[PDB]
Write a protein that binds this ligand. Structure first.
Ligand SMILES: [Mg+2]
Lengths: 4, 244, 222, 233, 240, 250, 235, 212, 231
């Protein structure tokens, strides 16, 4: 999952 | 179901009393009288045995006075078996406190937890209350010498002198009469025995129908000693104050 | 050691117009270098004018879709047959996904339909339930091939007004359904050319205020 | 967390115009040891469904018991048990698929790949696959293990898309299946010569053939092969 | 677990176990709370059929729950310990998570909630206790006084009393307390509190306790003479 | 299903009596007489083996039981209640003492544990009190010989000598006349045998009397040799023959 | 005695029926539904003049679009309100929307029969639940301890209820303005109340789509009281 | 991510970028990394996209329940401590969050709390959080004064995110800007770096490292 | 009398009085009717109100696309039982991809109710249900009583004065049983059946409630202006  | 056979031990009367507590107290009122008296330099515990048989082994016996830790003892009026359950709890509770804080448990704190246990049996669980009243005698470095009582309701109060069990009405009147604040231990010893002597339902007070204990600073310098009297020691203190 | 995940390939794509939205996906299903099926649909009508695809590990994708369809059923039972709005579906799906945060569904999820003002809407989710509304999203194996094409052709990125000295951007505008289906079909044929897990067939579900229509197209089978 | 011990190799299958064919050899391997030879890996359920299983045989036997218990349970308080409320192939499949995915989700799989072949009550052909991961799919042809690599390409030459199914007779399809089984015996080191085959036809019902053998094998050219390059005699 | 539904409804719509818990409160020693302009005073009767009491160690009737809030009660004494402990724990837990001490209203609502819970849970009887809870919210100087009872209902009072003969002293306060002009000072407020208790008590000897609570955690218990002075001073204004 | 009796079946009446304990004591009153006498070098416990039918073999029914090698028990009241108490008493000697300290519990403490069990049957939910009084005779290194009586309430008392059950009042009087602090164990056995004849109706021999002692260590009863600090059980049941030997010189 | 979950020979639950008696002893609560809003008004009934009446809280917010009034054993309502608030906020978390008033009411009513030998007795309090949602507009619900709830155009509960309900039967029509409905609640309350209605012993509230659920201050209510006397005097 | 928030004379500035990445893949350029909890409360997101989004909207629900129960808006301290006590329960499970809880109450004044998934909770005037935090710090610190005008503060916050968006590969897209005052938060727009960079380069004369 | 304290007690004539008292709440319930042909099955229910300011309590609940029921008696008990049915229908779909047989729905309800008639502390359900559905063997109507007895019928009715409708349906049998392929005619017959149970009242537009399920109709409910067609 993506991170910011 | 089983609801049919439930006495409902933890309910209020229409007057707002707890039946089972009242009836437990009624049970305790026929128990051997126990007296606590607090002096400036120590405490006395005296208690009358439930009427002896000559064949009872009286020296290796204990029915009334129990050691909780080194600084605290109790006098029992009521069901002995019920009292032992509570005594082992109290003994363990004392040790938990010591283990946790590296300091001996303050007397009130011990008394409160035992009383809190009793209280629980009157509010939840549907079990019968413990048919026991205690006189607690102990020392700690906050309040010094302290006397407390607890009863099946789990209510506790502190005293200069107090009695539990049989004939507390007569006994309390007599203590009120002769007690005075500046009293020494040895005077309190005498007061305790003289009070039992007059309130007893027996013909005359003898060594073999008694248990006796002191809590003094009467060891060596700023530290405290519990003395649970041997039969021969009671026989002597009974002579020393001229009751026999 | 037992590995509870697998990868079934394929790719999906959602585009939203002014009064419609599409959700497309190829119909190929694979494991490793083998084809399992050339036609195994993975875009679904879920009721209440919502279409949904959950692409990646098919078993997880099917479980999730099943759970959401069921969620729609109970939403009716519990709230007096009320219509489940797309924004509410999106949030519900976040909780479905995040509920398995520590043993995730290995899928990239996209749903499409109409918002409460009748405008086309596409929502996309990461595997553990992060979500966001967009005009535009590709997901799955060929996502990286198709997405930048969509940035360019749907949102007119890096495109300027000729002779304005690269100072005035190409102005944004909604696309017709005819234009959108063209971009979808080209996106998938291009993806099929360059990605081995994409091919066989293309199924498009179009969503307007009159319901859900399907269109199907053959894709290269190599 | 498991590892398969006694195992069954490929299960192959396809749809034809009136029904479905499914086959699987009668071997239970134990690593490279071909340990057991009378192993039935096709299990019929009612007279409208055959379930073919590859992978761990202890888990296959567990699944047999589930299916046989399912039949029993379906008959309970069901006066239409042998009619409108008979078990369909789609019911049997979904039940298995549900179990397979739950077991993978508990990190304790049934170490199998399963093909459920049959005919629905409305006459439709049912062919669907499920495995230890709970992955499911449908195709005109389905195979497991080496079958997926070697049978599918052969069976898809016959039925390559949906429209090819009406055009395929049971003689043609059985030929393709039987030929595919020979190839697997040539090339799969964990296959046996003996196998079972079942046809579920919407008219003739279930035909279950046991003790089939791979025949018409080409081995003669072996005599002409000398050495590995330069050797002559 | 012991399960019996002890608090149940009777045909007339009464819960007798709750109502009998109120009877236990009625039998309890009197407690009164009066709030001034800038303080709250808690007065408590102590029944005087007891000499040889040790007052150093005997549980006082007003309890600090936190350093800015006190609680007193009438009814079963053993029951009141349970509520006080729970209240004390909650006070610390509130500071831990909210980083602010409890409001008097919040703490009252909590104690009230505990009391209510015991009126519809199996295997337990209601608390035979009503409480007066008083103090000042953090960084606030407006005084607070609340009352709870066995049923769980709670509310705010300009002044209130509970326990035996509380109707006599409520009577007193109702004609002697001006909403418009509350006891403008400590001295004034303590007096009104002692007067109301003298309606019911006996001698103002070792019979009355008073605890004063001012803002910012300023709580002090008056001792015999300080109270005794108030008693002496009221009877000398009485002969008129 | 399951036990929904989680409330006490023993409660205080308005006069303060606990009915079920009183009634349990009444069951003990009905029970056959048993007694114990404490000598200077031993303790004796005895009772009548009052058989149900003469077809019954009453050696198979032991009323006097070994608890530890130095502790024995006898009872008056309800036999089945006693049997399970012995089972529980034997076990608690191990679980709550021997498995902790590597030695058997002293008499008072084992007694204390039995009392606890009996007290719990007086307050716990869904049970009645035990319908028995026990006499527990025992020896331990630091307390010597001792004799205890345990009642349905859970109360226990140390005795020089006592009796319980049917003819206890009479038997207690008999024992006051004969008991002194100089009794050698053989004298205590003799007094026990005299006291018991008063209350026995029918046959009075070594087949109808059950009698055990806590006395000297019995190496011959140990079962092994080679650890000189292990000297054998102080508990011994007298045989049918041993009793009859003492009845001719009665 | 006899089980808490027992049926009477008429086929009613004793405990539920007895809780309905407790509710009749409660202070009066009235609600009126209009197309411009829903009004909720209650009788505070201070048991003594020393008790500070603003501390009497018988009208309560559930969410911005839902309000609640109660009558009976009001301490029993704390957990019902707590459940209601959680149910409302949770729904908004799961679905990014406002929870319907009927769904809220049904959620609270599910609690009601979860008693037996779960809680030990039914609740001794009835609830008037008033709110707005986009689907069914302004709504009023009467939620009983039987688990039953009824939608109403207007409803009174508590001691003065049978008198007040008959009055509401006459006065309610499908075109009441909000201001008419406020006055009407005030009027009917003054009729059935023991002591004389003023701004300190009664309290008003409404929920409108635009500003949500608001409890009226005493200054605002006092003026509607004054406006009500001048309306009655003037004919 | 790059996010910042700083206190000053005129309240609080909050500025964040809008990029999400999965490795080197740019997953989105339009993420809303500020969550509007209530009209006086803001939360910033950095770390796991789902973790942040889920638990910060969950936080809003908890703050709403506080004000229903307590008839009062929740304090910044208490709101931040709900989140930090929540993530502390999950410590070791692998949650990934770096958040700032920003708001005004009358009892507190303007207040910022930094809260992360190791369970760290810090009150402070300036924080920058995310993979681009150091870049933002460099600009922000070297121009920060307590007395910045609201106008200058807004620009500095915006300019600091721009700095990080440029140098940090994992920050970019657009700048989102907020100002928080005694009257609540005010949104100050979405600013695409696409156009903002060139605008700032031209007007400010900075970014000379870049081919103009 | 001495034997009606709980469900776990038989009377000396072998009766269960708490179950019988549960049956009594059904009798106080507003009337509802079920009937079916070979192609459809219909529920009609008379809804009851509190007074003229109140709503009319719903008596019909959808269980699945092919199943649903009407209630008479304690409404919360119908909510519990209908919710159980929803789950059971649901489980049949997710696990077996199979629409639940109406007969099995019947057996499942019987067994659920029965448990509450043999154990201490519980209580019988205080509601009667009429279940209709269309499944693999056609249209069905079931009658559920909280004794646990479930019965399959061509038609029936329950609640106060249901004996009027139940008599009417008993004569009408040969007619309504053969109203195939005509929804509106089957409903008309149902509405007439219920009318035999009215006293001092007749069917208004916000008083009547109808539901239908069958060959190509999902279970749907008609209320308000949608039932005006039938008055
Ligand atoms: Mg390709």
């Amino acid at each position: 999952a993506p991170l910011x | 179901g089983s609801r049919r056979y439930d006495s409902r031990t933890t309910i209020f009367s229409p007057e707002g009393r707890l039946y089972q507590v009242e009836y437990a107290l009624e049970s305790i009122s026929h128990a051997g009288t126990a007296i606590g008296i607090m002096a400036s330099d120590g405490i006395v515990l005296a208690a009358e045995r439930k009427v002896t048989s000559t064949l009872l082994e009286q020296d290796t016996s204990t029915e009334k006075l129990y050691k909780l830790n080194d600084k605290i003892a109790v006098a029992v009026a009521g069901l002995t078996a019920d009292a032992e359950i509570l005594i082992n709890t109290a003994r363990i509770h004392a040790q938990n406190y010591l283990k946790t804080y590296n300091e001996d448990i303050p007397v009130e704190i011990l008394v409160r937890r035992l009383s809190d246990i009793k209280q629980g049996y009157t509010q939840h669980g549907g079990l019968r209350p413990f048919g026991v009243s205690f006189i607690y005698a102990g020392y700690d470095d906050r309040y010094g010498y302290q006397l407390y009582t607890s009863n099946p309701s789990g209510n506790y109060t502190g005293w200069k002198a107090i009695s539990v069990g049989a004939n507390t009405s007569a006994a309390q009147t007599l203590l009120q009469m002769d007690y005075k604040d500046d009293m020494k231990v040895d005077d309190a010893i005498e007061l305790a025995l003289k009070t039992l002597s007059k309130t007893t339902d027996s013909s005359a007070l003898t060594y073999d129908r008694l248990e006796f204990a002191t809590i003094r600073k009467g060891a060596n310098d700023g530290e405290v000693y519990q003395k649970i009297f041997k039969p021969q020691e009671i026989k002597d203190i009974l002579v020393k104050t001229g009751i026999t | 050691q037992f590995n509870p995940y697998g990868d079934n390939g394929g790719t999906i794509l959602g585009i939203a117009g002014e009064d419609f939205a599409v959700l497309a996906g190829d119909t190929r299903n694979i494991t490793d270098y083998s084809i399992n099926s050339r036609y195994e649909p993975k875009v679904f009508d879920c009721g209440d004018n919502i279409v949904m695809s959950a692409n990646g590990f098919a078993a997880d994708g099917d479980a999730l879709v099943k759970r959401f369809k069921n969620s729609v059923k109970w939403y009716h039972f519990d709230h007096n047959d009320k219509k489940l709005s797309i924004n509410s579906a999106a949030r519900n799906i976040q909780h479905l996904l995040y509920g398995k945060r520590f043993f995730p569904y290995y899928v990239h999820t996209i749903i499409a339909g109409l918002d409460e003002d009748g405008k086309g809407a596409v929502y996309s989710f990461d595997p553990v339930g992060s979500y966001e509304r967009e005009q535009c999203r590709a997901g799955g194996a060929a996502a990286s091939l198709i997405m930048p094409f969509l940035d360019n052709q749907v949102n007119f990125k890096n495109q300027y007004e000729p002779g304005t000295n690269g100072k005035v951007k190409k102005p944004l505008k909604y696309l017709s359904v005819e234009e959108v289906i063209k971009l979808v079909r080209d996106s998938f044929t291009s993806a099929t050319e360059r990605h081995i897990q994409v091919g066989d067939g293309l199924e498009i579900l179009i969503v307007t205020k009159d319901g859900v229509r399907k269109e199907f197209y053959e894709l290269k089978r190599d | 967390t498991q590892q398969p011990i006694v195992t069954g190799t490929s299960v192959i299958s396809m749809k034809y115009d009136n029904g479905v064919i499914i086959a699987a050899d009668n071997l239970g391997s134990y690593g490279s040891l071909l340990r057991f030879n009378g192993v039935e890996r096709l299990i019929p359920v009612g007279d409208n469904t055959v379930v073919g299983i590859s992978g761990d045989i202890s888990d296959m036997q567990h699944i047999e018991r589930l299916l046989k218990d399912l039949v029993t349970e379906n008959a309970y308080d069901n006066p239409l048990a042998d009619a409108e409320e008979a078990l369909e192939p789609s019911y049997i499949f979904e039940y298995l698929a549900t179990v397979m995915y739950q077991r993978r989700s508990k990190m304790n799989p049934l170490w199998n790949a399963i093909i459920v072949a049959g005919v629905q009550s409305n006459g439709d052909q049912f062919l669907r696959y499920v495995n230890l991961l709970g992955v499911t799919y449908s195709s005109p042809t389905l195979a497991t293990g080496f079958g997926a690599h070697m049978a599918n390409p052969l069976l898809r030459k016959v039925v390559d898309r949906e429209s090819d199914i009406p055009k395929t007779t049971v003689q043609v399809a059985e030929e393709a299946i039987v030929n595919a089984m020979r190839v697997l015996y040539y090339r799969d080191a964990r296959s046996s010569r003996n196998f079972s085959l079942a046809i579920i036809d919407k008219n003739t019902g279930l035909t279950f053939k046991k003790n089939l053998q791979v025949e018409n094998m080409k081995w003669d050219f072996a005599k002409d092969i000398k050495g590995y390059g330069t050797q002559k005699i | 677990g012991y399960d019996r539904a002890l608090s149940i409804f009777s045909p007339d719509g009464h819960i007798f176990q709750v109502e009998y818990a109120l009877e236990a409160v009625k039998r309890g020693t009197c407690a009164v709370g009066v709030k001034g302009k800038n303080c709250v005073v808690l007065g408590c009767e102590r029944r005087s059929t007891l000499k040889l009491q040790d007052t150093r160690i005997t549980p006082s009737k007003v309890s600090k729950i936190d350093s800015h809030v006190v609680l007193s009660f009438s009814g079963l004494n053993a029951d009141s310990r349970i509520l006080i402990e729970k209240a004390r724990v909650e006070a610390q837990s509130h500071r831990l998570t909210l980083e602010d001490p409890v409001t008097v209203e919040y703490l009252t609502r909590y104690v009230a909630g505990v009391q209510q819970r015991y009126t519809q849970s199996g295997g337990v009887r209601p608390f035979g206790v009503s409480t007066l809870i008083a103090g000042f919210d953090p960084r606030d100087d407006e005084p607070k006084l609340y009352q709870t009872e066995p049923s769980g209902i709670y509310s705010s009072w300009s002044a209130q009393t509970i326990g035996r003969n509380s109707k006599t002293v409520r009577e007193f306060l109702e004609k002697n307390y001006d909403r418009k002009e509350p006891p403008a000072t400590v001295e004034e407020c303590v007096k009104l509190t002692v007067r109301s208790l003298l309606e019911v008590v006996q001698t103002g000897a070792k019979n009355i306790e008073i605890t004063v609570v001012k803002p910012d955690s300023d709580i002090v218990a008056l001792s015999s003479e300080e109270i005794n002075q108030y008693v002496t001073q009221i009877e000398q204004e009485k002969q008129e | 299903m399951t036990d929904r009796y989680s409330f006490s079946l023993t409660t205080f009446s308005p006069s303060g009596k606990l009915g079920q304990i009183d009634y349990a004591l009444t069951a003990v009153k009905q029970g056959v007489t048993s007694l114990g006498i404490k000598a200077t070098n031993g303790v004796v416990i005895a009772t009548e083996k009052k058989s149900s039918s003469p077809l019954a073999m009453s050696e198979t029914l032991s009323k006097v039981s070994l608890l530890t090698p130095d502790i024995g028990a006898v009872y008056s009241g309800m036999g089945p209640d006693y049997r399970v108490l012995v089972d529980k008493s034997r076990k608690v000697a191990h679980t709550s003492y021997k498995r902790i300290y590597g030695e058997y519990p002293p008499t008072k403490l084992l007694v204390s544990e039995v009392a606890k069990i009996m007290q719990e049957a007086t307050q716990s939910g869904g049970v009645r009190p035990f319908g028995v009084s026990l006499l527990i005779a025992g020896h331990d290194e630091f307390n010597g010989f001792s004799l205890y009586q345990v009642d349905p309430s859970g109360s226990y008392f140390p005795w020089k000598a006592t009796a319980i059950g049917k003819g206890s009042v009479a038997a207690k009087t008999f024992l006051e006349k004969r008991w002194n602090d100089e009794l050698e164990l053989e004298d205590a056995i003799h007094i026990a045998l005299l006291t018991l004849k008063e209350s026995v109706e029918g046959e009075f021999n070594g087949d109808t009397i059950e009698l055990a002692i806590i006395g000297d260590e019995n190496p011959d009863l140990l079962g092994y040799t080679g650890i000189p600090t292990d000297k054998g059980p102080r508990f011994r049941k007298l045989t049918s023959q041993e009793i009859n030997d003492r009845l001719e010189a009665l | 005695d006899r089980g808490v979950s027992t049926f009477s020979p008429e086929g009613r639950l004793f405990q539920v029926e007895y809780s309905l008696e407790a509710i009749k002893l409660g202070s009066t609560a009235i609600g009126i539904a209009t197309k411009e809003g829903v009004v909720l008004g209650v009788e505070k009934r201070a048991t003594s003049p020393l008790l500070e009446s603003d501390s009497i809280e018988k009208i309560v917010e559930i969410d911005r679009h839902i309000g609640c009034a109660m009558s009976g054993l009001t301490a029993d309502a704390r957990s019902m309100i707590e459940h209601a608030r959680t149910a409302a906020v949770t729904h908004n978390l799961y679905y990014d929307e406002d929870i319907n008033v009927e769904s809220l009411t049904q959620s609270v009513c599910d609690l009601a029969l979860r008693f037996g030998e779960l809680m030990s007795r039914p609740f001794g309090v009835a609830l008037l639940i008033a709110g707005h949602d986009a689907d069914d507009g302004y709504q009023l619900f009467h939620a009983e301890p039987s688990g039953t709830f009824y939608r109403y155009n207007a409803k009174a509960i508590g001691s003065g209820s049978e008198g007040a309900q008959a009055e509401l039967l006459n006065e309610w029509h499908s075109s009441l303005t909000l201001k008419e409905a406020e006055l009407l609640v005030l009027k009917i309350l003054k009729q059935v109340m023991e002591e004389k209605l003023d701004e300190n012993n009664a309290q008003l509230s409404c929920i409108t789509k635009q500003d949500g659920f608001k409890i009226y201050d005493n200054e605002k209510t006092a003026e509607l009281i004054k406006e009500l006397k001048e309306k009655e005097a003037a004919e | 991510t790059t996010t910042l928030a700083f206190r000053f004379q005129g309240g609080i500035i909050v500025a964040v970028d809008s990029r999400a990445t999965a490795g080197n893949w740019v997953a989105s350029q339009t993420v809303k990394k500020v969550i509007e909890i209530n009209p006086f409360l803001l939360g910033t997101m950095a770390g796991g996209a789902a973790d942040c989004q889920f638990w910060e909207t969950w936080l809003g629900s908890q703050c709403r329940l506080h004000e229903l129960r307590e008839k009062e808006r929740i304090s910044v301290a208490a709101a931040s401590k709900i989140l930090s006590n929540l993530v502390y329960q999950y410590k070791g499970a692998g949650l990934s969050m770096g958040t700032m809880i920003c708001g005004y109450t009358r009892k507190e004044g303007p207040t910022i709390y930094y809260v992360d998934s190791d369970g760290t909770r810090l009150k402070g005037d300036i924080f920058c959080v995310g993979s681009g935090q150091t870049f933002a710090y460099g600009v922000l610190d070297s121009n920060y004064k307590w007395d910045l005008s609201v106008e200058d503060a807004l620009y500095l916050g915006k300019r600091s995110i721009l700095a990080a968006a440029h140098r940090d590969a994992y920050s970019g897209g657009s700048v989102n800007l907020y100002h928080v005052t005694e009257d609540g938060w005010i949104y100050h727009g979405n600013h695409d770096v696409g156009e903002l960079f060139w605008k700032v380069k031209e007007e400010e004369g900075s970014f000379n490292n870049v081919i103009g | 009398n001495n034997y009606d304290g709980d469900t776990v007690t038989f009377s000396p004539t072998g009766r269960l009085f708490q179950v019988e008292y549960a049956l009594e709440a059904i009798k106080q319930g507003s009337v509802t009717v079920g009937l079916r042909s070979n192609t459809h099955a219909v529920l009609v229910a008379l809804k009851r109100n509190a007074d003229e300011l109140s709503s009319y309590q719903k008596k019909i609940i959808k269980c699945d696309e092919h199943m649903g029921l009407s209630l008479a008696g304690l409404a919360p008990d119908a909510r519990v039982l209908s919710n159980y049915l929803r789950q059971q229908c649901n489980y049949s779909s997710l696990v077996f991809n199979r629409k639940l047989a109406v007969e099995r729905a019947g057996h499942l309800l019987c067994d659920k109710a029965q448990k509450n008639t043999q154990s201490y502390g519980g209580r019988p359900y205080g509601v009667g249900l009429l279940i209709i559905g269309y499944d693999k063997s056609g249209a069905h109507l079931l009658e559920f009583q909280p004794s646990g007895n479930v019965t399959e019928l061509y038609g029936t009715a329950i609640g106060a004065r249901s004996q009027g409708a139940k008599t009417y349906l008993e004569r009408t049998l040969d007619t309504f049983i053969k109203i195939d392929g005509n929804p509106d005619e089957l409903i008309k017959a149902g509405v007439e059946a219920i009318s035999q149970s009215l006293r001092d009242e007749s069917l208004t537009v916000d008083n009547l409630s109808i539901a239908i399920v069958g060959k190509d109709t999902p279970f749907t409910i008609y209320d308000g202006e949608a039932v005006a067609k039938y008055i």
